[PDB]
A paper describes a structure:
During activation of a pentameric ligand-gated ion channel (pLGIC), the binding of agonists promotes the opening of a selective ion conduction pore at a distance of more than 50 Å away from the binding sites. Each subunit consists of a predominantly β-stranded extracellular domain and an α-helical transmembrane pore, which interact via an extended interface. Whereas [name] forms a cation-selective channel with high conductance that is activated with high efficacy by the primary amines cysteamine, propylamine, and GABA, the cation-selective GLIC is activated by protons and inhibited by bulky positively charged compounds that also act as open channel blockers of the nAChR. Our study has identified a cluster of interacting residues located at the β1-β2 turn, the β6-β7 loop and the pre-M1 region of the extracellular domain, and the M2-M3 loop of the pore that exert a strong influence on channel function.
When mutating Thr28 in [name] to aspartate, thereby introducing a negative charge that is present in many family members, the EC50 of channel activation shifts to a 45 times lower agonist concentration (18 μM). A similar increase in the affinity was observed in ITC experiments, where the agonist binds with a Keff of 90 μM, a 90-fold decrease in concentration compared to WT, while the binding of the antagonist acetylcholine was unchanged. Patch clamp recordings already show considerable basal activity of this mutant in the absence of ligand and increased currents upon ligand application, whereas no basal activity is observed in WT. The single channel conductance of the mutant is similar to WT, but the current density is lower in both two-electrode voltage clamp and patch clamp experiments. All experiments suggest that this mutant stabilizes a high affinity state with respect to ligand binding, and we were thus interested whether it would be sufficient to change the crystallization behavior and allow us to determine the structure of [name] in a different conformation. The structures indicate that, despite the drastic impact on the potency of the ligand, the mutant crystallized in the familiar nonconducting conformation, which further underlines the stability of this state in a crystalline environment. The role of this interaction in channel activation and the destabilization of the resting state is underlined by a mutation of the respective threonine to aspartate in [name], which strongly increases the potency for the agonist and where the channel shows increased basal activity, which is not observed in WT. This basal activity demonstrates that [name] can, in principle, also open in the absence of agonist and thus underlines the validity of the MWC model also for this channel.
Author numbering:
A (entry chain E), B (entry chain D), C (entry chain C), D (entry chain B), E (entry chain A): 11 to 317
């Protein structure tokens, strides 16, 4: 079994696609192993670049293909090079930009946190072993973080493991285990923007809707709710267009649904206070009570949301 | 007739395009057959990868082209390999990402269910037979389902069949039958998100639209309807922007049309009650009767929609 | 002049682009002609696939290049094969997906009808003749039509013709005429969705805008129109976002312009009735007359639109 | 210096990108020159297509590379051919679809006019001269123009010129002038659609915004302006979504600003008339005077816009 | 160490992607060095174009690969040429279109300024030195600037430097320093468009929101505020749709937040003025005081934003 030392340099992780749970990874991949020694020009290690690489493979050079398991589509490899050492060492280095897949839970959207993972595996050989994996995720940790959309927490975690493929041929008596390198990078989304421009005005609108009970007439109370109703419909739009599309509801969405209910419940209480008492009494002890209680009932439901 | 065994590993099904009735399929495809035996290095099976494969084809190796019938454009093939066994067996294994077509009816959008199908066929040979197809659609069934957008119902259904092409040449006496593999995976859309954030407020708005009869004056009844009319127009927008575009009306759209109809009929009844009775009588027994009947008439019409 | 027989299988025509007047065509293309006889393996017709095809061309095989004249960008050819017959016949067969251009008039948008055309022509040879064209547009005609967006009317029409190129070199004495195959498929757009979800509510709003005259006060009449005015501005949006972008006005767009005019003319009549009569008379014989006449005047102008 | 005759056939100019000032050009490019005579099959001119072309270049055939100077990215070349004459003439013919760049001023958007230009230049040779350029822009001039988005004014203008590159090597004593072909096609945008569906209703709303002065009360005057204000805010949206994005303001945009100014100035005048006269006189000679003057003040400012 | 002279011609910088912090660069790249002399046809420098280039590399020609460090994905290279001088000089010249990454701060969006940088480095050699870098950023400086979206300030800054790579193999004793060319182009965004069509009406709306205090009744004051609230929500949409998406708040967005705050504070003050005084007094000295103070309090807060 050949010992392969790999190294993955991660320049930038960007372009998170929430609809498809993908993310782009630009960087380099390096792999080193030692083979049969070789006659080189003079005796320094030889450099073979791009199109010249396959010429050496046509003459018999063994270069194994390592596949990104969780990739989404063939990645774009930039320049690639072979470094042929006289003592037998061989170093493959290639620039790449690829889109990778992983299960991503966005339910607590403004305050959510995700991990971007890479999974590397030889495509055809199980009799070949990844000896050690070193990643260099040397993007900043204390340079730009509050300004950046994502907060990288710690240095990336590595784990070389063995995957057992059961469904295989009938000619391998026992060789159905492959070497898989798994890189994981944890990050927390910066909620600063979504708080100020989305969660804050959504709070401002929800609160001001309770000011309908400070209207004196009943006609003023019920008609105003429908203009407030329209405003909630409009603010759900301003969010949904900018906010990413999802198959599920976020925290902000729960806030929006709470809006529709607070206004509809206000419409109920406003109409309830009118026709609850006999002979047309307006139950003014309700309008003034819920004038402050209706603000309080919403705050109590919000904490059981975090139950 | 050559016996060809295929195996299709499905990693992820995503990216449903409702406008064009298409869907993306990422995974692997493996094909094995036995030909004339071959001298290999030593005698272990030889592995030939990517660019090296066509070198063997140029020297005479027969590798048939298998085409996805219902594909939409040439698929993106990642790494590909040939496993040449000394006894004559040949194993082709390749990663692919492709977009596939099938007839998809989205009319009952929030609660719809579809089946994603693959159709595989040799491009040039009918004297060559697909012997058995094993698919490994080992995406989850009981891990994330309520969280995931689609619910896979059962393991994929397979069907090897024979397609008769009539319009052909004049030189084939009887050989116009080709082997087609047809895989089918049934899935149900998770309506959770579309219910809470779209159907519920649409119900809240449609329901609250009936509270126009609880206003006392006629001027209040007719003018408020125009503000409610605007809200339904706005809510049709909020839906149409996020919801996928379709050549037909969905359930939600019928609800929207029911919204427009519920409001317009109220305007008729509101104007009807004013000028229906002689000498300016306001038919107060109608406003109060339809005060509860108008909510019920909508609920009664909704059940005949499910007729 | 070499005799070449072509056949075009059309699997699916989709993806109509109204801004650029283009549409996608997926299917197969087959071409057969007879050349000098040939020594084949044994004596069965030889099948040459994809990358192996150009190998035969390098050794002298004559395979003319056929170009889609009205294509928009080089088409995506999937698998391609050569079937080499011993008697001299040669069969080229290839799967293709291409984008094609044609003049498309969308002015009567919901109810418009178009025809998708293909134009095939040899790229370099006039001393070589297309003998007959048979198309197999065996997409359904009576399976899904009310559910499908477009209605195919009849079997596709074919026409091989001759195009005269004047601007050419100075060395051709008379050879400036090339063989062009022209296929045409006529189709009518299904307006069901645009009627129910777009044309129907647009009528409801236009009609209900006339109910402003059933308001008793003049202040009620003029102020409500501005809320109705805003509604028409909003509904032009809901259409324009979903509806395709065009360089000209459609039927629906003409409907919207009538909306702005119906509301603006009402504002004029509402203000006219106020200040037309001496000493502040409100010309009540106008408000009630146009109470039904304003609905009728719109219906009368609509028929002269179809003049 | 070799004499090269070019000819450019333009099938369709489409896909104007206003954000990046680019446009797509589908058509053909032909080039002819005479070299050393040549032995051809029999003695007819030989035709070499696509993949076969580079075979002749590897054997020594001189085929210079002509670059589109103002191209945006490598263009999509379809089929390509070489016509080799026995007397030495060589004819290269190729289909292409490319995106081209030019400086475009969109400030007068609905009524603007542009010119589409191509610039062709040899990539490596200055000792080789483009002898004459003939373009065949045989797209219609009197077929579809009012229906088409753009109006081609005249036949394309041509200009072969010499471009002096100063910053070059130190080994060329004087050879730093290259032959550039410059083709120009003038076109005027058809404003029909943008007039009816955008400029017309924008006038209707701006005009109808002035109808606030025919309201009797002061409370009616001030509150309605805010609904008109929202309507202008809404109509600015309807335009901006459909209208192209630009780094500068168009004519329609100037109309919108005049709208906000017409409404904001109205809001100022409405509050001014209330509190301008001592002891609460309502300055009724202002409301009626600007009832007609405010439409005129807007019309007076509009002509100085075309100053 | 080989001395390599590069020259970078920049035709156009466009297509800034604010989501991914990228920008497109179209232009040419030239590189010259001197090697062992060479026998050329006759003795003039030989020109080798495109596909013919690798032919010389297969025969042994040393052409180093130079990689764009801050590129995002492999760039699109148009035509490429080699100029082989007899004395040993070699000139590589190629057209390219590439997307480049750099840290870009958009927080002061309308009035922001950025610098577009390029970083060039050999892909495999440290024993080869970039001798001097000359850029020809000869895009206009005084032709169209007020019309153009970006303002280039000065001639581009260059800097060849040495980057020390630590994490390397174990066989290099001290050779871990590479030559990096760094080009920087500073530019200021033209705020003309964003000022007129976005910041101005936002001021007009924010200012006109203070006119709610000129209403006489309390019911007029509170109900109108909810109509103004909707306008700010709508105007937050009109901005967000056209304006580029960002992970943080811009100046305009801060202005939007101030809008929501100015309106909500008015709603508090409007409700505060009603119920602040004993026995239902309406505190008329506040509505009139904040009638002008609320405009001033907003202006006072705005200057501390630029603190």
């Amino acid at each position: 079994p050949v010992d392969v030392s790999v190294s993955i340099f991660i320049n930038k992780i960007y372009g998170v696609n929430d609809l498809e749970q993908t993310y782009k990874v630009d960087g380099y991949i390096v792999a080193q192993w030692t083979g049969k020694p070789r006659k080189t020009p003079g005796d320094k290690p030889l450099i073979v670049e791009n199109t010249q690489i396959e010429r050496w493979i046509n003459n018999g050079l063994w270069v194994p293909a390592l596949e990104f398991i969780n990739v989404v589509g063939s990645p774009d490899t930039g320049n690639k090079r072979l470094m042929l050492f006289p003592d037998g060492r061989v170093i493959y280095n290639a620039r790449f930009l690829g889109s990778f897949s992983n299960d991503m839970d966005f339910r607590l959207f403004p305050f959510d946190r995700q991990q971007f993972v890479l999974e590397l595996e030889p495509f055809s050989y199980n009799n070949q072993q990844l000896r050690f994996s070193d990643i260099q995720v040397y993007t900043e940790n204390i340079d730009n973080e509050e300004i950046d959309e994502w907060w990288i927490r710690g240095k990336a975690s590595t784990h070389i493991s063995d995957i057992r493929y059961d469904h295989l041929s009938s000619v391998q008596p026992n060789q159905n285990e492959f070497s898989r390198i798994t890189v994981r990078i944890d990050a927390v989304r910066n909620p600063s923007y979504y708080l100020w421009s989305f969660i804050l005005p959504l709070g401002l609108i929800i609160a001001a809707s309770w000011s309908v009970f400070w209207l004196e007439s009943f006609s003023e109370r019920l008609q105003t709710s429908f203009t407030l109703m329209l405003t909630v419909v409009a603010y759900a739009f301003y969010t949904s267009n900018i906010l990413p599309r999802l198959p599920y509801t976020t925290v902000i969405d729960q806030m929006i649904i709470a809006g529709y209910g607070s206004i509809f419940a206000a419409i109920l209480l406003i109409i309830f206070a009118h026709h609850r008492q006999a002979n047309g009494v307006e139950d003014d002890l309700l309008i003034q009570r819920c004038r402050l209680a209706f603000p309080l009932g919403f705050l109590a439901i919000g904490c059981v949301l975090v139950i």
